[PDB]
Structure 1
Amino acid sequence: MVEDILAPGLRVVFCGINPGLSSAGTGFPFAHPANRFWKVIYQAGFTDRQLKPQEAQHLLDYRCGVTKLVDRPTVQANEVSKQELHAGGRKLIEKIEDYQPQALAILGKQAYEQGFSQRGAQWGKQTLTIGSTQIWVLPNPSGLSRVSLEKLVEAYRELDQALVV
């Protein structure tokens, strides 16, 4: 099982589909060294250095959170049904109403659409909100995505900069 990293007052809550088979075992989000997440949020600007999955809890210090749509671990994100994704979204909504982050960031275009029942969603900011929490769709940091690091970084960077203080 992979515990959530949430707290009130966060500026961003990162959300993935489900745990990979490596992450599941370690009990850390995006634990497999092939997943660009940690490098991306670092380079994007969310952290002052590149954290290891071990230090995940220290994200709160930078006022960032992490969670997932579906708990069931899996090799590839595509093994999770829409049924599971749609249910996952419903529960995510509650956590957001609970912790009330400045922004919810879904890592997966399909994830978003399924989880929130939305069609033809575009990358970036969504008009959809959850109270004061704004919603974003960011490309998945998996090394399976043919999306380049340079692209991935910009995407997240836009959000960071988008959340002023």
Structure 2
Amino acid sequence: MVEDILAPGLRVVFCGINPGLSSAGTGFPFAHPANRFWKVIYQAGFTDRQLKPQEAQHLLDYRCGVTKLVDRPNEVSKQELHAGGRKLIEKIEDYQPQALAILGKQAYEQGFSQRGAQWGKQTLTIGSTQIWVLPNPSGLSRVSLEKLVEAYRELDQALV
């Protein structure tokens, strides 16, 4: 499983769903060649160039962090979503960055026991950290690149 990339004073902590898809089977988050995370954050303006999975630690230099809401074991059901939410919230309470972005609607709905959640900014918070639900970048996410960039861009803008 991939290691967290967290610290204090972060502007955003990007939270992935499952601990992997090989976008973790290299030790680097979002390493599967078909994952648009890196491209999206560059284009959304969180970074100045498209980092490479190998350069994941460099995210800190942009005051960005990466984590996942599940940590052990294809499927991925409520069982593990709520449990992960718990460990997750603790981490966010620890480093409490400006915003947490969950890369998945239904995953946030589950992991955080919310329902009928809509894309974007949530009202719920973890201490002062804001909670944002953004569409996952995976190549298996039928979301178009444009909708993706537009969604992340908004978060980036909002944090000014």
Normalising by the residue count of structure 2, what TM-score does the alignment of the two structures yield?
A: 0.96
CA apart distance, 1:146: 1.2
Q: State the percentage of identical aligned residues.
A: 100
SS for the counterpart of 1:46 is: coil
Shift of 1:145: 1.2
Q: 1:118 deviation in Å?
A: 0.2
Q: State the shift of 1:106 in Å.
A: 0.3
Alignment partner, residue 87 of structure 2: 91
Distance 1:91 1:140 in 2: 20
Q: Tell me how far 1:22 sits from its aligned partner.
A: 1.4
State the match for 1:47 in structure 2.
47
Unaligned runs of 5+ in 1: none
Runs of 4+ in structure 1 displaced over 3 angstroms? none
Q: CA deviation at 1:110?
A: 0.8
- CA-to-partner distance for each residue in 1:31-74, whole Å, 9 max, x for gaps? 1010111000000000000011100000000000000011236x
Q: How many residues align?
A: 160
- In 1, are the aligned partners of 2:24 and 2:30 still within 8 Å (CA)? no
Displacement of 1:20: 2.6
List runs of 5+ in structure 2 lacking aligned partners. Answer: none
TM-score (norm 1): 0.94
Per the alignment, residue 71 of structure 1 pairs with: 71
* 2:127 counterpart (117, 127, 131): 131
Determine the C-alpha separation between the residues in 1 that align with 2:140 and 2:25: 20
Is 1:18 aligned to 2:14, yes or no? no
Contact 2:101–2:131 under 8 Å retained in 1: yes
1:23: Cα distance to partner?
2.6
**RMSD of aligned C-alpha atoms?**
1.1
Deviation by residue 1:82-136 (Cα, 9 ceiling, x = unmatched): 1101100000000001001000100000110111000000000000001110000
The question of whether the paired residues in 2 share the 8 Å contact of 1:19 and 1:30 is answered with: no
The structure richer in helix per residue is 1
Whether the 8 Å CA contact 2:7–2:65 is kept in 1: the answer is yes
Other structure's SS at 1:42 match: helix
**Separation in structure 1 between the aligned mates of residue 116 and residue 102 of structure 2, nearest angstrom:** 15
Aligned residue for 2:124, secondary structure, equals: strand
8 Å contact 2:38–2:50 — kept in the other structure? yes
